[PDB]
Point group: D8
């Protein structure tokens, strides 16, 4: 899956290739944004870690499986 | 069909083709606005939007 | 009527052609901005729906009938 | 005659020709500033402005 | 006096020629910014009125007499 | 001598030549930071700054 | 190895080469996010970041 | 030491050459940001004074000794 | 009816209501883009004088 | 179906829904960009006309049929 | 009456009130843009002079009489 | 797999998932940069038609 | 009295108080725009040396 | 090791980790910028390819070995 | 004393304190801008060197002696 | 010691600490501005390769 993260007050998206399923990523993002844990972590297919300050997320776009 | 989402403090709109009706999309947006809006396009792409960062949602003519 | 909506922190206006009267649009906007309903909906002459987060409205310009 | 409205976080001014007097426009602006300002131009265009997003209002010389 | 007003989150200054003395303008601005009246009014030498939302003032520069 | 004031959310610095000492200017800035800072340049130009909009003040080498 | 820090309302990332492991950097970031994050690069440069101004931290593949 | 200060909502860094040690500068910055004194002062090798509104600091980068 | 003109290196579009047909506006724009001036008038008689080299795009709405 | 046009020196894309096939649009765009003089003209599914100054085109993205 | 001048690579329009007729202003602007060399000069109703570098004109909007 | 295209005077990158090999994409870009059009297709068949003069960079990810 | 100079690709105007007449300033600007340098002095003797190619506009206020 | 590429008219640098020596990268960059036509191509330590339009290069910073 | 240099396509001025007279600086700037090729070089009162690419100069403001 | 390079159309300066003298840096810049490449090295051996056409200014600090 291509995953794209829009960051508030920035025109540049975080984009990476995920090895997880769309439902897995959706659940991660949804749960992070609703239980206010402050930090959302998403890891790409090579093991790069993206640690995102949840309050600065504008949107997450999740591609097709 | 076409849905455009304006994001606060950003010049780029999220634009996608929806298989839902205008009233269906409107209900999702309306309910969210009164912290997360989730919309799916006709191909199954998922858009998870922080409601506080929504400037507007434009919903095109049905078909 | 041409209707133009200025969105906070954006140089680009929402502009559309309305089939409603200027007084109708004025009342819609005025009531939305004063009873804090969170959402203002305006629909153009073709039935395009603009759902606007009322707090992000800078201004609404309403043209002559 | 000419009225210019500066909008916060925007480089574009709202500019129109008013048929009201400077004191009339000033009273509307002053009252609003202390959430909505409504002004009409000489042709009947309506400007509905969110008072919190007003940076300034410049009112030109009367006539 | 040339008077220049810096507006928050804008690179463009309001600039006008004042017929008032520097001390007069200083007192107007100082009093407005300290008694929180919401509105500062400054009028230029031709009678143009600048009505400024006091919270959106970054600075006022007042020239020499 | 040279004083530069950085204003939040603006690329333009206020720059002027001061006749005061670095410690004098520093005291004015320090006191203000802990809603208005007033500084005068060597020619008597007055700078009235909203303290909340100050990003930094750079004070050059004395003389 | 490569660490990139996105700063809110800024187009420029802080980028440096770390001698720490991904889990070590992640722990520092995670702990800070829940007002100051301090990170040191492989040469001993110190990055002191206001946690409220962190948009993201990207941690590259270990080695 | 080169010291670079990132200011919130500005792309331009304050950069200067310090005569202090990296640990000295780190302690100054750390203490200022944690005891909320409102003002951080850093002085360069020539005696230029940088008075920074602590809330507007995004980051401080401190070079190698 | 609605005409929108995108201007190069500017985020603000010129938007007006035209009393002309879509083909009328299209042909004016096409012809201008091949003295360096495009002139368009709106339904109220406002005149838009556009430096053709600074036109990024013109969007023309549906007729009537 | 969806066509997105990137315009040079602008962060905002022109986006519309096309009733033409991807190959049809590709041919029109390719021909316009290779006789790089004047105009690329496209019509959307409702009959709106997009007249694009070919020299100001950064990219055209054509979606799946 | 109202004349608005768009300047290339700037979001801010020059706006003034003219005492000339729309046809008068149109002729001046048209002639300036077609002998595209140097200056378009317009005077407002108070006698302020606007000297515009013709090559930096994006558009001129002329209002209703 | 991931291809990112930087466009001159724009902060937004074109990013897509390619089904082609790194060398295939590299050679297309290299050849285009020497009719002023680069055409790339993603794994779903989306077509990207890029004005070669407006390309700042192309980043090509690791194969597979 | 007030003179405002718009500089290309910049949101900040040069603004100063002139001791010259409107026609004096107008003729200086006009003549410069036809060595690539415009020089203007304000009422205090500040000198503004402007690269004529970077002038977008000059606004000249009412006399006195 | 770290290579940073500044791109004209963009605030965002391309940054990657190189497995080549500083002299190797310097020679590649120098040659590309002096036969200033087409492409500078660099590979990072993981095999990612950076194809840079040489005319749009503002600077290349090459870190310490 | 104060010299301010406006750089094309940048909102930030170069500002420094000069020990030279206004006429001296004016002559240097005038000559540089009229043999418009390469460099304008100015030194401040502390001996800092400002090397300015003459073609990228928008304006130079020279303060009162 | 401190060298600052302003890059055209960018708000971010390249800033580094130089081990060279002011005249050494000045002459390098001057000579480059008259193959389109300026190369400068900092005190740690970082290399800055600058496209000379994109240089707006170079500020050179006081010696030592």
């Amino acid at each position: 899956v291509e995953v794209k993260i829009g960051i508030t007050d920035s025109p540049r998206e975080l984009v990476f290739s995920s090895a997880q399923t769309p439902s897995e990523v959706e659940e991660l993002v949804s749960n992070a944004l609703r239980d206010d844990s402050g930090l959302l972590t998403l890891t790409d297919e090579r093991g790069r870690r993206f640690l995102i300050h949840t309050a600065r997320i504008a949107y997450v776009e999740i591609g097709v499986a």
